[PDB]
Ligand code: HEM
């Protein structure tokens with residue numbers, strides 16, 4: 001036989017620990033660490049997950065070559081979402097020189113989103129931010145003209161796509177279950193929306209964006225090179241990594257601000273003061289806004305949108321006396337690691353001061369403060385994501401005041417899917433400032 005790695009307790013349901021991973025993934029990953037240590041395992045259906053935690057194990061995880069731990073085929077639930085379509089058999093839109101423009105675009109999207117708010121009212125954070133980020137992502141990554149042809153429908157269907165990521169995907173992403181069925185219908189709904197837009201552009205051409213370019217590409221015969229399914233597949237793929245992440249992070253940032261009015265007041269004074277120089281959001285969102293940035297960092301430590309990072313071992317490796325065999329699913333968890341007691345004093349408390357100049361607990365714990373991951377695969381959209389949070393709230397916090405419309409403890413995440421979403425209701429009251 002072979003040496004067995006430590007295995008966390010429980011996991012006696014039909015698919016081992018899968019059932020528990022769906023109902024309470026963080027509790028399960030935490031128990032793995034509490035019982036096994038830096039290297040423990042749990043069963044996800046027919047796959048064994050080697051969960052790593054702590055600086056040393058995380059370092060190995062984040063510094064391993066794309067040839068040692070494969071990120072491909074690690075997230076089987078994504079295949080049906082992107083589709084088989086192939087256009088060209090992130091980088092561009094994310095170049096620094098483009099940031100200024102995106103910041104201006106984001107400010108515009110926010111103002112348009114709150115345009116009808118009036119003096120006072122209420123909103124649900126998930127509905128608001130999920131939709132807002134569809135508009136920010138599509139406008140910045142695909143084009144403003146394209147976004148102007150999008151409405152709440154695109155948002156709703158994209159949400160359905162994200163919800164079609166049940167852990168059962170590790171059994172088979174095409175299992176005949178409701179969430180997967182809705183997933184497929186939603187994607188077809190998305191393709192139809194794009195097809196309608198394409199037809200509208202054919203009928204009355206511009207007097208141009210990415211869609212216009214793609215629409216104009218043709219094969220020999222003269223027939224259009226790309227179908228609506230292929231283009232949609234690409235657009236979906238381009239917006240996925242930054243949607244649910246920015247959406248959730250935006251909601252939690254506001255939630256923590258309302259939960260901690262002293263930090264909220266600090267941020268307000270800061271914003272009012274900084275923008276007193278008369279420079280635009282496109283200027284300030286790309287520069288230092290310390291109080292808000294520290295609130296964001298702490299929000300990300302406590303509420304990382306990706307609670308688990310997956311890889312597929314392509315060989316045999318040794319991590320702290322433990323053997324990883326090729327074929328094993330190897331994982332790291334920002335959820336668990338970001339709260340390691342030793343690395344972050346009072347890990348369960350919201351303390352943006354951790355990131356202040358003299359403390360910088362984020363830079364000090366290079367292998368455990370991992371909301372954006374680390375190493376070679378560190379989130380490439382990190383700078384954009386931070387800029388977006390800066391731009392969104394520079395507008396929101398200066399225009400309106402926000403208060404929780406439900407118990408502070410009632411705001412929570414839904415972890416029933418691999419793609420974490422804020423749970424509803426998430427009711428918040430707003431009222432114009434000044
Ligand atoms: C503040 C919100 C965000 C958080 C917390 C976040 C977090 C992460 C994490 C933890 C990873 C690593 C996954 C792994 O190691 O397997 C990642 C990867 C990635 N993220 Fe984000 N992200 C955010 C926003 C965004 C945005 C807005 C974009 C696009 C504009 C984006 C694009 C990407 C891409 C393309 C990757 C893959 C990098 C690679 O493997 O080369 N992210 N992100």
Ligand SMILES: [Fe+2]
Pocket residue numbers: 122123124405425426427428
């Ligand atoms: Fe509400």
